[PDB]
Amino acid sequence: VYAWNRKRISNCVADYSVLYNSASFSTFKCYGVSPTKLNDLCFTNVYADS
């Protein structure tokens, strides 16, 4: 967590239906956006911090 990894996602298409239809998550909280709207939104960049 102190050296949390960051990856930059750009210039690609993502099917977020797979992500939020998954039952493998205990926490899935989206602020400022809805999980079911991501398939209709285009973003300049995404950062995945793990």
Binding site: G32, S34, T36, K37, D40, L41
Partner: protein, 49 residues
């Protein structure tokens, strides 16, 4: 000399400008554009904004 008339026009214009500019205020919402709120948020969360 015609300022009295022009003044009136100016005032009206000013008022409308302010009105239009108020559409760019968030008033606490995440966005001042209704289309962005509706396209990003579910109805339960969109109605709050």
């Amino acid at each position: 000399a015609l300022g009295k008339l022009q003044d009136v026009v100016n005032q009206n214009a000013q008022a409308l400008n302010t009105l239009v500019k108020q559409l760019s205020s968030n008033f606490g919402a995440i966005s001042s554009v209704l289309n962005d709120i509706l396209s990003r948020l579910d109805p339960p969360e969109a109605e709050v904004q």
